[PDB]
């Protein structure tokens, strides 16, 4: 059983936006431990984990296709220089992630690849919370004040 | 922090970051295979570098230096078995010369704290070393079939 | 209940009850000549395409058709170990084409639970021909006699 | 017996924790006289770390057959403020991590390789309490004083 | 806001402390160093209840609004041997009750009674020390100075 | 693979543990058939230190492609009394430390940083076992030799 | 003690000293090349000699005699495993002849309890033949290779 290659080219394309996004927010969670905002850190690390889970899970069905899974390129890190910035290259980020999960689904559709949706169609679910987290986060900068926010990220 | 240190440890930094990918791969490849042992090894040595790689932030980070994850190596990616365990242990060998560098440095500007987070890595890729030599060793003493049979259910 | 919508879920019915059968003699052919191992993981795949016949059977009255369980196809039946699997990789290969079919009709008709039902169903049939696949491919990798050896044993 | 150099460096790292105890208790109570309790718990827990280093260096020295100085105490940085408290056991931490660094040097030079290694244990709790330091620094500048102190009123 | 002699002498007994505490913990160690591993636990347990004599009085001073000095270490009295060190700490305890009592004379003078309540049981645990070191020497004149160090080898 | 002269040391170091593991081991045998049953139960807990010293050393060298020598059995130091056994294993240990200082400069030398850590954790437990020899030895002046082995005769 | 006794206890000590180092020896290097059931079960044999070597030991004490840990025999160490097999099988064979004619010795004086100790000291090692013989026939009857492959995993 060989997948469909546009498929397959698809799932790669997935695959190195996790890579990208499994060492940004690993980054951007030790610089938030470094700066002693450890509840930013520490929720930015189970992000960076979420995402190294989805990556594996397309590891698995790239081989099961009998596609070669490509951890070798790795596209641009989007690395913000205060917790304002870095939420919103997550932001970015995930909103790039999603249009290509949306595409990515259209191509399984039109092959009957319904098992490669479904999967795909799963991590669009975690990208859309992390997208919710995200708007949530930069909205209660603008609500409570980035002082403010920030305080209530010091402590776990 | 001192500069050049900074660099060896971005550097040991960027060898973590091609062994965590190169042994993900190498073990989703075995399990694809249904050599489920060597594939739970594997990624039990992906998860390794990842922690060492995580210590190596910390280090550069506190150090006030810029932790480099953009920069991605040469994945050694084998093709059978018996490839792929050399393409390990190569990474290895030039993880481990690149370590002895950086603590030689360390030692000359008196970082004590950084050499003993780069000798403790070393252990760990010395262990990974042995455990390589060891599989190859074995290849050669029962035969490649045999170590695959050995290797298929965990 | 739409009309085609029921004949392709009796469709895809029959199919699993062709499974059954088959690897319900598969696994007791392999428990015969003492290759456990196999015989215990045919006897799963043998109960798992029990459950999809159940589903499909109670989706059917639930639309208000028929469930055919009178029509039962040929079933592929291997004389040794590598012919056994190859019947039963070529069985689910046909299978995963009905179920794409079918899954298209449903969607045509706005029937998205059936869809789902079928969908679920066609995850775990791909798992079984990932099974099928990895295990033909031992048999290349390490050879008949050794993967025989593997599966006497639970 | 030891290296008389050695010894000599042992005490003088003996010294640089007899300081650290002091301020550090002193700190620790004051901040929880004004009510900055989480601040109070932690500097208390800074102040037990060098009373347990000073215990190692104190054997250390009595197995080379030297004699522990206990008597001269140096100098407290004593703030009148968290901010000045916060930095005055930052420069101390610097100061002691230079000494660290020389005796290390010495020990090295002369083989005394598990006194190299005693110190290079309490290097790493030093520089762990400097980690500790610059970031409360840092905190007071990223959210102000105020809320930084706010944050450290409870445990 | 307390007295100002008060203040003067809770930073004298403050200071007595800081004295015992050094030199108890030097002793104690001299004695693990030798191997009379008893002498040696029970002089560490003396000087950790001076180091909580010491944060009480650190307490009380702060609450009355005086400085606690910790910067002056007066003169450590150490023992070349077991007699001379179980000397030395009770020399030590008299020259404290001195000034516990002192002491206890001005706050009862202005009115401290809160102040006095603390140097009485600071004081109760000071003449239990020296019951301790006056039993101890006795018990060298009774079984020899060989007996008494035997007894003291294990815990 | 590992260095030439590397091995070799480690061959030295092994040399050293195969002498103290027999040296220690008779000794033990001896105080307990005298009925110095606390005396022979530290000295066997000394003799099995060193066989898991010979065993990491003989592990290291493996990895390294050498050949651990087992069949060199240097001079044991047999002591004819308490005293004489006690100077015995000091004097063993004082030479085993020389020779880690030795292998350690060599590792440092050429880069081999963990045979270094593997030696400088030998030397460390050796440098313990020294204390314990010094402080045995300095109990028997300071209580006499009989009391000393009463001190050793029950566990 | 006789001094005929004694110096047959020195002699059979100095056999269990020999066979202490060849067995962990032996043992690390079955370790060091992953063969992991032979290394354990070879370090096993090792704490065995450890403990009839300190039974002999309290035994000449006892007599009032000298033990002799200075003289250490020739250590036989192979270079694979059927070679390391049937050296610890050689010492095994000299080790039980010396084993029965100290026991003839004790038995000419009257010495029967350190004729006993002998005697379960013999049992002990005839029990060490049994499983040496039996592991070079298991290498006869399946090959080489086989028998490595059974002792790579515990
Ligand atoms: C900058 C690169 C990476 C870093 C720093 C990193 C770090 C970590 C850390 C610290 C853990 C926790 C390990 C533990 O303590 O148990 C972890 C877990 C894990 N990592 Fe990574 N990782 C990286 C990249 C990757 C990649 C590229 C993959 C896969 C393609 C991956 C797959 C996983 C998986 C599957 C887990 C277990 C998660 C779970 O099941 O909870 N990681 N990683
Ligand atoms: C101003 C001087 C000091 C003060 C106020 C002080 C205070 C304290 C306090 C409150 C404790 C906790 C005791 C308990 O609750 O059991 C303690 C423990 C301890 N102290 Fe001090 N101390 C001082 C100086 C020293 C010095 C100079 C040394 C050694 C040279 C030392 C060694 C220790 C040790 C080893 C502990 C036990 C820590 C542990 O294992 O948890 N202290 N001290
Ligand atoms: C190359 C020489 C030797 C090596 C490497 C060696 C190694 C060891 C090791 C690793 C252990 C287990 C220790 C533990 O993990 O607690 C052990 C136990 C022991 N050793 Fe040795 N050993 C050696 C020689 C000897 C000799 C010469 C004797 C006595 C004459 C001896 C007597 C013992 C005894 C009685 C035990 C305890 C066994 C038990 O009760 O299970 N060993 N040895
Ligand atoms: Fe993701
Ligand atoms: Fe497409
Ligand atoms: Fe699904
Ligand atoms: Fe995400
Ligand atoms: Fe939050
Ligand atoms: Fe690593
Ligand atoms: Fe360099
Ligand atoms: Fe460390
Ligand atoms: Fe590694
Ligand atoms: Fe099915
Ligand atoms: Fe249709
Ligand atoms: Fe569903
Ligand atoms: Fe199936
Ligand atoms: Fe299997
Ligand atoms: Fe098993
Ligand atoms: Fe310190
Ligand atoms: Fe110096
Ligand atoms: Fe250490
Ligand atoms: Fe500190
Ligand atoms: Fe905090
Ligand atoms: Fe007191
Ligand atoms: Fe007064
Ligand atoms: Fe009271
Ligand atoms: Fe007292
Ligand atoms: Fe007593
Ligand atoms: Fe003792
Ligand atoms: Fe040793
Ligand atoms: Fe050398
Ligand atoms: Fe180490
Ligand atoms: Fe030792
Ligand atoms: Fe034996
Ligand atoms: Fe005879
Ligand atoms: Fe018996
Ligand atoms: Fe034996
Ligand atoms: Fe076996
Ligand atoms: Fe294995
Ligand atoms: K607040």
Same mark, same amino acid.
């Given at each position: &059983? ?7 080219? @698809? ?9 990208? #996004? ?5 980054? @951007? ?12 850190? #520490? +929720? =930015? /690390? +189970? !992000?960076?984990?979420? !995402? &190294?889970? @989805? *990556?594996?899970?397309?590891? !698995? ?21 205060? %917790? ?13 992630? %999603?249009?290509?999960?949306?595409? *990515?689904?259209? $191509?399984? =559709?039109?092959? +009957?690849? /319904? ?9 669009? =679910?975690?990208? !859309?919370? $992390?997208?919710?987290?995200?708007? %949530? ?15 209530? $990220?010091? +402590? =776990?």
């Amino acid at each position: &059983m060989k997948g469909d290659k546009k498929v397959i080219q @698809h799932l790669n394309k997935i695959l190195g936006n996790e890579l990208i #996004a499994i060492n940004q927010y690993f980054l @951007h969670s030790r610089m938030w431990n470094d700066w002693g905002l450890k509840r930013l850190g #520490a +929720h =930015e /690390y +189970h !992000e960076s984990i979420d !995402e &190294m889970k @989805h *990556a594996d899970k397309l590891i !698995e069905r790239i081989l099961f296709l009998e596609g070669l899974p490509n951890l070798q390129d790795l596209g641009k890190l989007l690395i913000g220089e205060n %917790t304002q910035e870095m939420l919103q290259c997550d932001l970015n980020l995930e909103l790039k992630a %999603t249009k290509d999960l949306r595409e *990515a689904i259209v $191509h399984c =559709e039109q092959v +009957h690849d /319904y098992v490669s949706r479904d999967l795909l169609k799963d991590i669009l =679910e975690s990208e !859309e919370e $992390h997208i919710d987290y995200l708007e %949530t986060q930069l909205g209660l900068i603008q609500k409570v004040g980035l002082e403010l926010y920030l305080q209530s $990220h010091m +402590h =776990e």
